[PDB]
Ligand SMILES: Nc1ncnc2c1ncn2[C@@H]1O[C@H](COP(=O)(O)OP(=O)(O)NP(=O)(O)O)[C@@H](O)[C@H]1O
């Protein structure tokens with residue numbers, strides 16, 4: 001049994017190494033220790049001091065450099081006896097304080113033990129290197145094991161959810177939180193791997209298709225940002241579906257709004273979506289001539305950020321892997337070829353250069369890029385040129401050809417690019433779901449992988465929606481861990497004094513999405529239909545409603561175009577430029593009419609299939625992106641409320657994507673804003689189990705521990 005064999009790989013990579021006689025000596029020491037700050041300006045930098053004396057209310061301890069200091073017992077962060085260092089479940093610690101919890105994660109992380117329980121939920125600290133704990137042999141070890149029978153692991157919480165699903169006949173979710181780069185997408189994939197394996201299984205083709213969906217989604221929906229070389233730029237909820245017997249019967253991917261803006265613009269050092277680099281690196285021979293391709297430096301949409309490759313990644317090899325996944329999932333050769341024509345066409349569109357005509361209207365003097373795009377998309381270049389520079393609109397009921405200047409023509413060309421790419425992405429997910437989901441499900445385990453909290457030098461509308469999604473997820477953790485839990489204790493009247501755990505994201509949520517008094521998204525929508533609005537009237541309206549009024553909002557003194565939201569994970573300043581256009585998300589109807597006539601069978605579907613190309617109305621206006629965002633988030637939250645949730649908190653070790661480098665302030669900020677210590681305390685002080693060290697409740701008896 002590998003669990004008990006100290007030579008096994010399980011022991012070697014998932015268990016705390018045996019300590020030596022010198023460590024034994026230290027472990028039976030009668031000395032006692034304290035975690036203190038050498039510099040009180042930096043509360044997160046701790047050293048260990050020996051406690052050398054005490055009074056009824058203070059400790060005196062030695063500092064690393066010697067000099068003795070005193071501290072009130074009520075302010076003291078005592079160090080755990082060292083037999084606790086490496087403990088698998090931190091609810092076992094005697095002293096529950098910040099430096100002690102960090103220390104335990106630190107000891108485990110120093111020996112590549114990245115998973116640790118923190119009471120009821122799992123903490124996963126990103127190793128930023130490969131650790132061989134996800135093999136089939138590891139999978140087989142965890143299969144069917146109760147949590148306290150095996151070491152902490154993403155496989156274990158996955159098995160727990162799978163047995164709860166069987167035993168309780170109840171849908172489950174696995175909610176994996178974390179800032180950008182923390183490990184959500186990798187851990188998501190391990191949960192899927194594990195479930196596909198243990199739920200069977202000779203009848204392996206579906207399981208393979210499920211796994212192969214990922215390189216396709218990542219190639220199109222992930223990109224290098226400053227926070228993650230493989231940042232997810234869309235959120236997803238993956239439903240792994242099981243028949244009533246408990247075997248996997250299918251899967252279905254719910255994808256959320258994609259950051260289409262990245263197709264046309266990337267900040268310094270970032271990349272566009274991986275697929276563009278994969279194509280240009282990995283085509284073939286006649287693909288490059290058939291698609292009129294050259295290198296990334298030759299395309300405006302890839303030559304701006306100064307970064308065309310990612311250390312340790314071969315875009316040409318990844319292209320082979322993406323195509324191989326497209327084959328396995330079932331995309332035809334003609335379908336793959338049309339997918340790449342659309343990628344190539346986008347890049348050609350981005351190389352159109354509009355310039356000033358005799359008058360204010362733009363003209364196109366060099367049509368090389370226009371012609372190449374039109375060739376690959378299968379559209380008429382003269383019709384496309386006219387739809388870009390001279391689109392027709394109604395003015396009242398009259399039909400009037402506009403003549404757009406350079407800036408507007410360029411923006412319209414970008415709008416067409418973003419629509420093509422976002423619609424292609426939706427089409428990819430739809431095609432995948434049609435393959436993966438071929439049976440009605442009895443049960444599901446849903447795994448949520450959102451885009452993680454992020455802060456850049458410039459934060460725009462996309463960042464506010466990403467960070468709001470993260471705030472809402474933290475609140476769902478707070479609701480589950482603290483608020484519902486104490487609501488039960490009351491509904492049962494069990495002698496329980498309510499405890500304020502001081503974690504409540506409600507104020508920030510009402511600021512962003514309040515109705516009600518109206519929050520930020522509601523005012524954005526109101527401005528979006530006001531004929532006379534500008535990004536400046538919008539910011540003025542926000543300040544008017546919130547400045548010196550809402551405690552989570554800040555009107556900054558250093559800028560007239562930004563506002564601050566105090567999120568659970570820190571304040572973010574948001575630049576208002578282009579918000580009304582991003583929210584309206586316009587696309588000239590003459591461009592749509594041009595692409596509806598495409599000779600290409602995939603392009604034609606992107607523009608004629610209503611599930612892909614149609615947009616809902618609200619009154620006399622198309623539904624705004626903020627409204628679409630809210631519908632998606634509301635649908636997710638409604639789904640989660642039907643499941644029994646399991647939480648995995650991914651923690652990034654530093655801001656440099658490096659292994660073996662824990663950064664104290666970075667880690668501790670996450671431990672605080674994630675509510676990890678509060679989560680351990682409720683576990684310890686509360687009454688985790690109730691049917692039908694104790695309380696007799698009105699209709700159940702509640703159990704502690706044990
Ligand atoms: N358990 C792991 N083993 C090995 N490498 C990992 C692990 N978890 C994370 N990584 C590395 O860390 C990188 C970022 O992790 P990822 O799971 O993509 O982050 P994320 O939380 O999904 N970020 P985002 O999509 O931007 O919100 C990965 O590409 C891997 O290099």
Ligand SMILES: Cc1ccc2c(c1)C(=O)[C@]1(O)CCN(c3ccccc3)C1=N2
Pocket residue numbers: 233234235236255256257258259260450451461462465466469625629632633636
């Ligand atoms: C549950 C949910 C709902 C909406 C979402 C997300 C998740 C995301 O993670 C994103 O898919 C990440 C990008 N993003 C987005 C992009 C542009 C505009 C608004 C949101 C997101 N919206």
Ligand SMILES: [Mg+2]
Pocket residue numbers: 184185186230231232449450451452
């Ligand atoms: Mg991700």
